Write an enzyme that holds these catalytic residues in place. Structure first.
Site, PDB file in Angstrom:
ATOM      1  N   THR B 174       0.840  -1.192   0.000  1.00  0.00           N
ATOM      2  CA  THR B 174       0.000   0.000   0.000  1.00  0.00           C
ATOM      3  C   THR B 174       0.878   1.246   0.000  1.00  0.00           C
ATOM      4  O   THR B 174       1.866   1.319   0.743  1.00  0.00           O
ATOM      5  CB  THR B 174      -0.954   0.038   1.206  1.00  0.00           C
ATOM      6  N   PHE B 176       0.964   5.180   0.818  1.00  0.00           N
ATOM      7  CA  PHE B 176       0.304   6.294   1.469  1.00  0.00           C
ATOM      8  C   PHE B 176       0.936   7.609   1.027  1.00  0.00           C
ATOM      9  O   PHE B 176       2.089   7.651   0.590  1.00  0.00           O
ATOM     10  CB  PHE B 176       0.392   6.180   2.995  1.00  0.00           C
TER      11      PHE B 176
END
Ligand SMILES: N[C@@H](Cc1ccccc1)C(=O)O
Ligand SMILES: N[C@@H](Cc1ccccc1)C(=O)O
Lengths: 279, 281
Positions: B174, B176
């Site tokens: 992921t 960010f």
């Protein structure tokens, strides 16, 4: 054998359900809990088609088509644009003054803030929007209202107190229709709209994308979608998802695609389908 | 306003978003928020100094639509973070593998851990939130209930990790971005430091229009690592693009590319100038 079922993600009465009924009225929508399940229904033969949302004007939930479609053995055979509207619904005979809380998806509440504050209600999170209508019909608490698509009102026997209560207008969701069999639209002969969707890989070096686009630019091919995706965890190579307005048998597209194939790897056409009049 | 030392994230305590906050900003206090919008609003109102927002996930996970939210907020990107996503099979303390019957997690998480549910003959059970499943297991105190959750949730809820990294596919990452209400640019690199500039721009929806806008990056050696199209309004008249390049606006090469971009676009807005993660090498 065709099962006449069209899968979608969500509960009965959702906007995805509305899209199935609008475009394929003689088909039977098949609710599925996740997008992956909606894809899997087409892979297994449970559904002939799947109605998958991929673009929404106001940051709604859309499927990651760039990830899911290349892994499937599936093709895009159509697209659909649905204007999104929210309806304020209550139990039969419930009056405006009785409502204290409005239930909808936490995202939906933020798009209908005007009517919640003007009436002094408390927005309450719900797992699913069509489920919010289902929840109101099941709990039978007269103080609980729901915000859901018009279809959910008829299905769950709820009264619509107010119409089109969404804050902003011009909220549109774009769907793509998926199929297991590779059906291409016929080459346009009288200036009909055709969309070609494809993926390609380039190295993650300066101008590499520029090289890939050169052929469309000098051949007058309009590109209407382009999304980047870096491969694996590393930053070595990049895959792109793209829509163009054109048919692969048209000379201009043939020339752009041939130039694209020299500058990229793993070019795969994911679909050749009729384009909506909104273009 | 007064610096609160809080960093907002979307989810419950113990989530992957919380893990990113603690890894990158160890001395800050994560501030859970039920939605991304609430995580934005926490920064707008001064409840939080920063917000930790996921924008890319390798296996089609849930991410915030940064292209819609960030241009409407008056906020800036002041950092990025890349977190490898892993799932841990956790149970009540001292519970043996033989006792588990059900595995609780977010439906998308259950879908990424099918092998360990099938190999052990368990029944996956839907839960609203992954970290919530760990909270649910600690609260119900039913020894037959296991959870699939990030490693952080096990420490917070005092749960035993029966098996580590049990997810089906590897390389689940992921990305960010760190958001702020106030603008701050990283200093211009002098010794090949990694810098990212994120911006949006608009072109007409006609052939070669994007090609013109990229021309300056192509001939100045500016590498672009993210690019997303967004057709404006309901019509197909104009298109907005969200882009990341590796470069600082004061470098001559980037200065020239952006200058060429300005001739060929409207409404160029720089949304952030920030240090780049070592993963880019
Ligand atoms: N980095 C390559 C390809 C790329 C472009 C844009 C986004 C992502 C990748 C280039 O600049 O041409
Ligand atoms: N349609 C324009 C701009 C655009 C490119 C790609 C995706 C979306 C829009 C072009 O062909 O250059």
């Amino acid at each position: 054998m065709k099962t006449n079922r069209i899968s979608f993600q969500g509960e009965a009465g959702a906007n995805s359900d509305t899209a199935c009924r609008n475009m394929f009225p003689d088909m039977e929508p098949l609710p599925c809990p996740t997008f992956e399940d909606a894809f899997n229904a087409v892979e297994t033969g449970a559904a002939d088609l799947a109605m998958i949302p991929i673009e929404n004007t106001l940051a709604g939930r859309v499927a990651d088509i760039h990830y899911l479609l290349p892994l499937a053995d599936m093709h895009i055979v159509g697209e659909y644009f649905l204007p999104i509207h929210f309806q304020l619904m209550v139990l039969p005979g419930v009056r405006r003054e009785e409502i204290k809380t409005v239930h909808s998806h936490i995202h939906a509440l933020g798009q209908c803030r005007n009517v919640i504050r003007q009436n002094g209600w408390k927005g309450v999170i719900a797992g699913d929007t069509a489920g919010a209508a289902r929840l109101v019909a099941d709990v039978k608490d007269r103080s609980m209202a729901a915000l859901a698509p018009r279809l959910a009102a008829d299905l769950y026997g709820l009264d619509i107190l107010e119409e089109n209560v969404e804050d902003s207008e011009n909220n549109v969701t774009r769907f793509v229709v998926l199929s297991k069999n590779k059906q291409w639209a016929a080459r346009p002969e009288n200036d009909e709209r055709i969309v070609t969707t494809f993926v390609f890989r380039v190295r993650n070096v300066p101008a590499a994308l520029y090289k890939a686009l050169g052929g469309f630019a000098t051949n007058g091919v309009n590109m209407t979608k382009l999304e980047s995706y870096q491969l694996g965890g590393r930053f070595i190579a990049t895959q792109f998802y793209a829509d163009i307005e054109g048919h692969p048998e048209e000379r201009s597209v043939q020339l752009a695609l041939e130039e694209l194939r020299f500058f990229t790897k793993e070019v795969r056409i994911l679909g050749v389908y009729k384009g909506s009049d909104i273009r």
